[PDB]
Amino acid sequence: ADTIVAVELDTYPNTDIGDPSYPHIGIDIKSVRSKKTAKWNMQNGKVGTAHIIYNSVDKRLSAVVSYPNADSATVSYDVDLDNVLPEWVRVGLSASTGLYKETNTILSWSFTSKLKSNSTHETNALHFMFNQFSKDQKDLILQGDATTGTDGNLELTRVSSNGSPQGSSVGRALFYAPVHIWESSAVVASFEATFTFLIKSPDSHPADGIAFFISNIDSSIPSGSTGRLLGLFPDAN
Amino acid sequence: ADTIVAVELDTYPNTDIGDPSYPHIGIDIKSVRSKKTAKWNMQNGKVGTAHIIYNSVDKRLSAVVSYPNADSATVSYDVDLDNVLPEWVRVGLSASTGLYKETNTILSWSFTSKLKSNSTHETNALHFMFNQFSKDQKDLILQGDATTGTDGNLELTRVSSNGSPQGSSVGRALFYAPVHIWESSAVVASFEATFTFLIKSPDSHPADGIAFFISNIDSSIPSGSTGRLLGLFPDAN
Ligand SMILES: [Ca+2]
Ligand SMILES: [Ca+2]
Ligand SMILES: [Zn+2]
Ligand SMILES: [Zn+2]
Ligand SMILES: [Zn+2]
Ligand SMILES: [Zn+2]
Numbered sequence: 001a002d003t004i005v006a007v008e009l010d011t012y013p014n015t016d017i018g019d020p021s022y023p024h025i026g027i028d029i030k031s032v033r034s035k036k037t038a039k040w041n042m043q044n045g046k047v048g049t050a051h052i053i054y055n056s057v058d059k060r061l062s063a064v065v066s067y068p069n070a071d072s073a074t075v076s077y078d079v080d081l082d083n084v085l086p087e088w089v090r091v092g093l094s095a096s097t098g099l100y101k102e103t104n105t106i107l108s109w110s111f112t113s114k115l116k117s118n119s120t121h122e123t124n125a126l127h128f129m130f131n132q133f134s135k136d137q138k139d140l141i142l143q144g145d146a147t148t149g150t151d152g153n154l155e156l157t158r159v160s161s162n163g164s165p166q167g168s169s170v171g172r173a174l175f176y177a178p179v180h181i182w183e184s185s186a187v188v189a190s191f192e193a194t195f196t197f198l199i200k201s202p203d204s205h206p207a208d209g210i211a212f213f214i215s216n217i218d219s220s221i222p223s224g225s226t227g228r229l230l231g232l233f234p235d236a237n
Numbered sequence: 238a239d240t241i242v243a244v245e246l247d248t249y250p251n252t253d254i255g256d257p258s259y260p261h262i263g264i265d266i267k268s269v270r271s272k273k274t275a276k277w278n279m280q281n282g283k284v285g286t287a288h289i290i291y292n293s294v295d296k297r298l299s300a301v302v303s304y305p306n307a308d309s310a311t312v313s314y315d316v317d318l319d320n321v322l323p324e325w326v327r328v329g330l331s332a333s334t335g336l337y338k339e340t341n342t343i344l345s346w347s348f349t350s351k352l353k354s355n356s357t358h359e360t361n362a363l364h365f366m367f368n369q370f371s372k373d374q375k376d377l378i379l380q381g382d383a384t385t386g387t388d389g390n391l392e393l394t395r396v397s398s399n400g401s402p403q404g405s406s407v408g409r410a411l412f413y414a415p416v417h418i419w420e421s422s423a424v425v426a427s428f429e430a431t432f433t434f435l436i437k438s439p440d441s442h443p444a445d446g447i448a449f450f451i452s453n454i455d456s457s458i459p460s461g462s463t464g465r466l467l468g469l470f471p472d473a474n
Contacts, residue, residue, distance in 0.1 A: 087373075088373070088375045108359075117368075117369060118369075122345075122368035122369075123366060123368055124366065124367055124368060124369060125364070125365065125366045126364070126365050126376070127362070127363070127364035127365070128362070128363050128364070129360060129361065129362045130361055131354075131359040131360060131361060132354065132359075132361065134417065134420075136324075136325075138325045138415040138417070138454070139363075139414050139415050139416075139417065175414070176413065176414040176415065177376050177412070177413040177414035178375040178376050178413065179376075180371065180375070180376065183371070217375065
């Protein structure tokens with residue numbers, strides 16, 4: 001089927017599908033039910049930063065979410081991606097609303113992946129950084145209700161003309177070029193992503209969150225994945 | 238039509254279409270008839286390196302071709318790309334044979350482009366480096382007779398099973414993601430490419446050469462562009 005490894009910034013607690021009783025950050029390996037979560041002091045109307053790192057030596061995936069003058073929430077998970085993901089992938093950002101709403105605005109996004117093979121510091125590396133999004137972002141595969149150009153930001157889910165979030169929305173943003181995430185003969189494979197966001201809610205119930213994800217090249221928004229499924233999962237298995 | 242800016246490493250002199258009476262390096266702006274050339278002491282069976290640089294302040298495009306222990310051939314041309322190329326492009330490597338043949342092997346290839354806008358060192362940057370090509374290079378749009386995996390090299394034009402170049406061949410290799418090459422509000426736009434090659438010929442008449450080029454997103458091998466047209470041009474205008 002569709003393979004998904006993601007780091008979710010889950011703003012709405014769905015105690016029923018395993019979500020902790022509070023807003024959290026988690027590492028989802030093929031399931032909306034995180035393999036590890038951590039309490040995240042979500043701050044409405046603030047600009048946050050998420051950094052995700054992984055290297056094939058420690059075989060550990062970690063994320064750090066922070067706001068200026070707010071302690072960071074950290075979550076790590078031991079996982080060897082050499083066997084949960086295919087050699088070639090695509091990386092993206094996802095977000096969704098459902099019953100409750102919030103803006104899922106991405107202000108910037110960078111990414112680097114490196115494959116140090118056989119010898120020296122000769123590598124295969126891909127790197128991109130967006131500090132501003134063009135209204136005609138030709139290097140981003142936009143999916144669902146995700147758009148760009150609104151002040152140079154990337155809006156992952158439907159927002160109003162006057163400036164107010166719409167619920168029941170789903171939108172992804174995948175980088176155009178496939179990424180060679182791992183390889184048989186690589187001594188060290190590593191990657192690191194960083195992006196800033198602004199999650200603001202009109203009502204006091206913000207929902208449902210942003211997600212950095214690594215999927216197969218051909219991935220598309222799963223059927224009926226709005227609200228709690230973050231635009232990444234078909235069911236809540 | 239199809240826009241092409243290229244830096245050719247022309248091994249065969251076609252005096253008739255403007256080529257100097259010897260192997261050269263040139264800067265072609267929309268024409269196979271270079272806007273500036275320079276003598277290049279081509280060396281059969283050797284590994285060479287080409288570096289191309291451009292920045293929007295000097296509005297100058299330059300290239301340097303060199304072999305270890307051989308003087309570099311240099312060619313620069315004043316050209317403002319803000320008006321010969323569209324905002325979004327694709328970058329690639331081209332090569333061709335015709336009546337005469339040679340290998341057009343690419344051993345490695347890197348590229349970086351940067352757009353420093355409004356303020357600080359915040360940018361939009363794309364970077365890639367291939368120090369070895371996979372048999373299933375999913376991030377390279379291969380065209381014509383170009384292939385990968387042969388010892389981790391990229392062969393731009395048809396070669397034999399035993400190891401010997403075939404004439405009348407044309408192949409390009411474009412990076413998958415479109416590159417935002419310039420923009421209206423950018424203080425400094427710049428790029429730099431570097432690639433190593435091995436041009437070896439069985440007979441004493443090597444032909445016809447490799448070319449780094451920047452074209453529109455949708456570009457494809459022009460009809461009947463083998464031999465002297467390097468896989469980039471429809472006619473010899
Ligand atoms: Ca949730
Ligand atoms: Ca020629
Ligand atoms: Zn969750
Ligand atoms: Zn493994
Ligand atoms: Zn020429
Ligand atoms: Zn200009």
